[PDB]
Design a protein around this ligand. Structure first.
Ligand SMILES: OC[C@H]1NC[C@H](O)[C@@H](O)[C@@H]1O
Ligand SMILES: OC[C@H]1NC[C@H](O)[C@@H](O)[C@@H]1O
Ligand SMILES: [Ca+2]
Ligand SMILES: [Ca+2]
Ligand SMILES: [Mg+2]
Ligand SMILES: [Mg+2]
Ligand SMILES: [Mg+2]
Lengths: 570, 570
């Protein structure tokens, strides 16, 4: 029977989404700082890699206390990365290449150097109630010692309440002191969020990645007899009252009210898309929360529709080099079991806040992990460097610039908190600073292994992480990956299969030995696999090359070894 | 295409195992206490139900502090239940009816009224080191102030160490003061466990349920500078030092050494089966532990073999009336993902230690839960009463006899700890004491609902929980259920499917609405299901009767409604 026809999916339902960290991607001007002209000079890389969409970490005006997540002007570009003119040139050239471009929208908080905050702190009409402002807690026992409104702890260490001398009140900061929480019960705040998104959509952005959504809304003091209620204590003896972990964020995180805001954003975006046409503009949400609270981002049982998807962080939070094949299968099944009917699944192996994929797992697992990302149904998310297997760089206490490490850590402990090792400059080639910059003075130090692990080397050599990444993004054009069913089970503690299958179309099978030992499996146990079958992709140190025939039902895999087999249609 | 033959499995790989609680099954002599003559009189009940195997809770000589789990003589019957001759008659008539009979083996501990203990406490030669005896912890702060060897906490509340005035040492009890922990590093103790099992196998027992295995072995003082190490503190503020929950059982539970004793028991049982022939004799292990520690009961990576299976308690520990269809699917997949290849799966919905199935879930979910139990691959475990949907009985403080409630509870709290509600006499009929006894004076009070919920009523009326149970045990004879593949997914937050399929044999599909609301599903989404299909079983509250034709691909299910559909072969 000739192959069945498939209906084309909207671009966002099966895109490869690549996360750029602009400060570390490409420095065009020799200051050791990545910039918009550098991204423009390398837009061709995304076409070459088979990436469909890029999301940039924040590039808006920022005092850089949290490297861009502390925004002083939501309507202009950070001078170190470029100008508004450079941003419009990036959108033009990305669009001319067929790429979608998403921006990082940071709705929870503004810089204390924003006009919003300067005006609010001065009680300017229209801005007085823009942020969460609170009087000290009544201290009847002992006045003249001022108490914060509650025991709430900041994500970056210390009290989430900061005293303003000028306003004689505390403001809330869930992040750095310099990151002030907006009041999302203020209709003027909600309108300003629509105004910001409309500004950037009108410039031509294809959508947003929405930062820190679990922290949008905190308890209304009207519900607690006019005080901010204390979060419960954890009881964990390793954390004192200034340390993140001391409290359970019952009154400060995952409040049901935050989802109404996200559903209002989607209604806004739907109307925008209806009134503008062209490619669907989308929102992807960031939030670390339990399965129930994460799936509420998609929408709810009463028919509300939220983000196009919430990010799936499961390969960051629940899988590591300690995981066996049964763990891999059980965690993969969690998103696919709990995601609502019609939801688009997505897979995230890394980001700028977490250790790099090959450091969390092992160096010999890079290809297997990139195959899982590309072969599971839905959307693959790649963090800058995963396409070449980059590793965490070494960063000394002296070179550490992450506010989280500087606030929570010291020269002995910093490494426990710092996100800097996942933010080291991208390895283009084996030239000075790995081709990231013409300067030796980079904003973070270049990882020592850049001579071994760089993009130019992997394009030159016959087998490489990059060549495997290219073969996998190319495979996603096949109807079996865009529309095919999936079947996933462990064959042993060491090896699992993933089968994509679609009647009249080729079958594709991942076999992956995630263990540190060899494993022999019976391919007779793999559904929809008729032999012989052809190796489409192999791990860079597999005995099997692309084009190799698998004829025997008994298969011995090395530690880390992964294969994609192409087999006849069912 | 005529139906393929399947090779018949050994009896234990797909049996329906029924747990009898002898004290509450059937009183033959009017003392309000269930007995062995009682059981003999109703062995026909297991043939009628489609039960293959019965396991009895303990029937050995016991002061009854823990209603049989405190054993004073491992080689004879508790007088209230009957005589050795009654036991021999039970095995004889049970075997005549084709039934297998398992005994509850309690290797962790003996009654302090056991000869073992009386001899041990007196330091008689060969018994001195039969139990864990320890000196008080040296007190350098105030010498000769008596301290327990460690902070360890009993499962029934209070210290796990009891002072012997006679011996001037502490003994270990993980359970009641009256349950004394054997020393499993003493080869004489290990020999005595073989001696007990051989005795009962020689009488013709078909094997054992093994009690309390996670607690077998505790830290050797020789590895902790010649003291028993304190268990870590939990930090949970609701637990004082005398309360279960105060400690994390790092040195008192799940020690790797316990598994070596289990593998030794399986090696002895394999040698017994080999030398005696006839039906395979088996061991099913009891232990509440995490998934890694649970799966080690089957065997280990070195090829050691343990229990035929450890009990799967997931429908007790991890599902309830709070669970939705996605929770049901994700918990069912846990055993099937983690169980070693070649392992036999099992499903437990209740026991004498936990609230009854219809109380933990809902009254309208009974049929759907019994369907899951019978239609999942492997072994179905039924607890006394689940075949008629018995609910927890009310038991006042005054009528409470469970040591766990009496030790950990009081008149206001006892309901939090007591197991008695799940142990109320079995509802045979609507006669005095629901036909459990001719006396109104029963050892626990007969539940108030026995007029509504009894076996006789369910055998007479056209649709019942018991008739459904009978229809499901009969279905287990079909090749599709013994040898079929499985496929399980959620269609919604309310409804899931379970498909058993096998080429050339009939297809069986469970559809179950686990919610309190009506749900409409598309049957086109269900793999291997071609319409029309026939209702084989329906919940007693379903508008569909057995024999009903499902023709439409749109299906509305009322709250708690479950159907088993019979559909043409694949
Ligand atoms: O904006 C606060 C916080 N949100 C999440 C971002 O990914 C992280 O880098 C940032 O520090
Ligand atoms: O023997 C101790 C303990 N083990 C588990 C048994 O099921 C329970 O009833 C008993 O109290
Ligand atoms: Ca907030
Ligand atoms: Ca013990
Ligand atoms: Mg630059
Ligand atoms: Mg299938
Ligand atoms: Mg009696």
């Amino acid at each position: 029977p000739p192959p069945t026809e498939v209906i084309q999916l909207d671009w966002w339902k099966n895109c490869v989404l690549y996360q750029i960290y602009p400060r570390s991607f490409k420095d065009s001007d020799g200051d050791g700082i990545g910039d918009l002209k550098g991204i423009i000079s390398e837009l061709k890389h995304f076409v070459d890699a088979g990436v469909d969409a890029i999301w940039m970490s924040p590039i808006f005006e920022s005092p850089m206390v949290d490297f861009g997540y502390d925004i002083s002007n939501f309507y202009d570009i950070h001078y170190e990365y470029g100008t508004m003119e450079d941003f419009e040139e990036l959108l033009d050239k990305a669009h001319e290449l067929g790429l979608k471009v998403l921006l990082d929208f940071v709705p929870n908080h503004a810089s204390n150097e924003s006009e919003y905050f300067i005006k609010s702190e001065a009680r300017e009409p229209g801005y007085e109630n823009f942020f969460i402002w609170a009087d000290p807690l009544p201290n009847p026992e002992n006045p003249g010692v001022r108490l914060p409104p509650s025991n709430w702890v900041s994500q970056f260490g210390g009290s989430a309440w900061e005293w303003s001398e000028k306003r004689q009140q505390y403001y809330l900061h869930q992040f750095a002191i310099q990151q002030v929480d907006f009041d999302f019960r203020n209709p003027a705040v909600k309108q300003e969020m629509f105004n910001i998104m409309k500004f950037w959509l009108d410039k031509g952005a294809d959508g947003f990645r929405l930062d820190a959504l679990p922290y949008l809304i905190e308890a209304d003091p009207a519900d607690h007899e006019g005080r901010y209620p204390d979060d419960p204590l954890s009881g964990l003896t390793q954390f004192e009252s200034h340390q993140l972990g001391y409290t359970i964020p019952l009154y400060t995180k995952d409040l049901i009210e935050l989802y109404d805001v996200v559903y209002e954003w989607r209604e806004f975006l739907d109307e925008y898309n209806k009134n503008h046409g062209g490619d669907t503009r989308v929102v992807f949400s960031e939030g670390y929360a339990n399965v129930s609270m994460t799936m509420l981002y998609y929408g709810n049982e009463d028919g509300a529709i939220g983000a196009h998807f919430p990010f799936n962080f499961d390969f960051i939070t629940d899988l590591s080099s300690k995981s066996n094949a049964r763990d891999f299968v059980y965690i993969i099944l969690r998103w696919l079991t709990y995601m609502p009917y019609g939801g688009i699944p997505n897979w995230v192996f890394g980001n700028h806040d977490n250790n790099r994929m090959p450091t969390r797992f092992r160096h010999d697992m890079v290809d297997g992990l990139n195959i899982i990302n590309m072969l599971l149904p839905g959307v693959a998310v790649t963090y800058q460097g995963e396409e070449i297997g980059m590793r965490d760089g070494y960063v000394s206490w002296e070179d550490t610039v992450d506010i989280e490490a500087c606030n929570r850590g010291d020269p002995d402990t910093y490494h426990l908190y710092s996100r800097d090792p996942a933010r080291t400059p991208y390895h283009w080639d084996n030239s000075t600073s790995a081709g990231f910059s013409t300067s030796t003075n980079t904003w973070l130090p270049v990882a020592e292994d850049y001579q071994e692990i760089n993009l130019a080397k992997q394009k030159e050599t016959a087998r490489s992480h990059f060549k495997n990444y290219q073969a996998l993004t190319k495979l996603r054009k096949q109807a079996t990956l865009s529309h095919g069913e999936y079947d996933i089970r462990a064959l042993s503690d060491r090896t699992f299969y993933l089968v994509r299958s679609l009647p009249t179309h080729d079958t594709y099978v991942l076999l992956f030995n995630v263990s540190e030992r060899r494993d022999t499996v019976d391919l007779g146990r793999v559904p929809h696999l008729t032999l012989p079958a052809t190796v489409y992709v192999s791990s860079i140190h597999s005995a099997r090359l692309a084009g190799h025939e698998i004829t025997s039902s008994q298969l011995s895999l090395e530690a880390g070894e992964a294969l994609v087999l192409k087999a006849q249609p069912i």
